[PDB]
């Protein structure tokens, strides 16, 4: 019940096509975030930099989605859609679209939001559904990736499963307009619902990498996906590292910025540890070095100030 | 004398336990560690590294 060249080549072409689309659209929405939030949506409440930085996160995450599809390109080229772990990847890719569309029913920001989202989500639904019907007839870096998947899981499971937050009132804030002492709105809600999907994409990328290269197929050429998991990350962090200068309020709402900051930090430290290969036993050598030093210190202290070592120990020969 | 001889041939494990093992390798190290950690302020050099 193997997979001949037919389904393999069809899946490969599907993957490369949709992934190129996601990649170029990610670059486009990056420059659009650099332009403004009125680039794609119609909510008139979009005169704030927080929409801009949220959209920068959107950009980096769609870059990550491109990386995911290039990963599946490189993986299924050897017809590796037979092991149950690729079935896990595909079913979770389907769950991406599942949660996305059911939450779109639970809320929508602008027509183009559902446009792009349902576009590529229906692409995923069709491919995974029909190919899974066909298949029916057939350490340290690990710690970082595990915490990444669980932090992003928490970010989603908390953000969407509840309706929405309410901004601080700040009683007495210019009783006129300028939204001071007011509630929230379409722009905010939907732009945010996006960011959640971006962190979902990188969540799925990371769960795939963990459950696949937890024996760290071939462990190395994942170097492709690695770039897609690092590059985006650092650039994301960049924007965040200047969000205070941009005059944004990132601190009042933990349910959104927390996962973004934590995932950026985790991806950056993952890149760093992959550059020098902390072997999960080198920390043992570090702690042993510091303990040896402090042992050498307390021995000198004891022999100099408390009780000589030639006194307390026994002497031989008489 | 005969009773002592009989009892000594049946009690070798307990004799070694009470003569060589009870204090020196069971009670003394426990007492020593608990007593050291009773004194000795809640530092790290003093709570873990110097012991």
């Amino acid at each position: 019940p193997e997979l001949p060249l037919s389904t393999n080549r069809a899946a490969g072409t599907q993957y490369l096509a949709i992934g190129a689309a996601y990649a170029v659209a990610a670059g486009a929405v990056a420059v659009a975030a650099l332009q403004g939030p009125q680039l794609l949506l119609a909510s008139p409440a979009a005169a704030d930099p927080w929409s801009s930085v949220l959209l920068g996160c959107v950009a980096a995450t769609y870059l990550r989605a491109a990386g995911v599809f290039l990963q599946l390109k490189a993986a299924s080229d050897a017809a590796e859609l037979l092991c149950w772990r690729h079935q896990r990847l595909a079913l979770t890719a389907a769950a991406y679209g599942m949660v996305a569309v059911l939450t779109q029913a639970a809320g929508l920001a602008s027509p183009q939001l559902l446009g792009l989202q349902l576009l590529l989500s229906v692409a995923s639904a069709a491919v995974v559904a029909n190919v899974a019907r066909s298949a029916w007839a057939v350490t340290v870096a690990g710690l970082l990736l595990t915490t990444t998947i669980v932090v992003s899981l928490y970010g989603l499971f908390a953000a969407v499963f509840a309706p929405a937050p309410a901004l601080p009132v700040a009683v007495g804030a210019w009783p006129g307009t300028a939204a001071a002492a007011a509630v929230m709105d379409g722009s905010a809600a939907g732009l945010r619902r996006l960011a959640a999907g971006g962190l979902l994409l990188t969540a799925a990328a990371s769960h795939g990498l963990f459950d696949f290269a937890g024996s760290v197929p071939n462990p190395t050429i994942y170097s492709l996906l690695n770039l897609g998991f690092v590059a985006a990350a650092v650039l994301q962090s960049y924007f965040l590292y200047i969000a205070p200068a941009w005059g944004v309020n990132v601190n009042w709402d933990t349910a959104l910025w927390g996962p973004m900051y934590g995932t950026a930090f985790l991806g950056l430290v993952y890149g760093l540890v992959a550059l020098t290969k902390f072997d999960w036993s080198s920390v043992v050598d570090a702690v042993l070095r510091v303990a040896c030093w402090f042992a050498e210190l307390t021995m000198w202290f004891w022999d100099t100030f408390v009780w000589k070592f030639s006194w307390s120990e026994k002497t031989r020969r008489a | 004398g005969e009773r002592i001889w009989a009892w000594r041939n049946r009690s070798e494990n307990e004799r070694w336990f009470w003569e060589v093992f009870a204090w020196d390798r069971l009670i003394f190290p426990i007492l020593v560690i608990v007593a050291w950690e009773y004194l000795v302020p809640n530092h790290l050099v003093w709570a873990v590294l110097a012991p």
Binding site: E313, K314 | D24, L26, I30
Partner: peptide, 24 residues
């Protein structure tokens, strides 16, 4: 192949005893 038992701790010196009165 060993058991789970302490080691003797007083075959070298006698300083350890200094903790039993003081703590007491």
């Amino acid at each position: 192949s060993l058991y789970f038992v302490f080691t003797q701790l007083n075959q070298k010196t006698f300083l350890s005893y200094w903790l039993l009165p003081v703590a007491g």
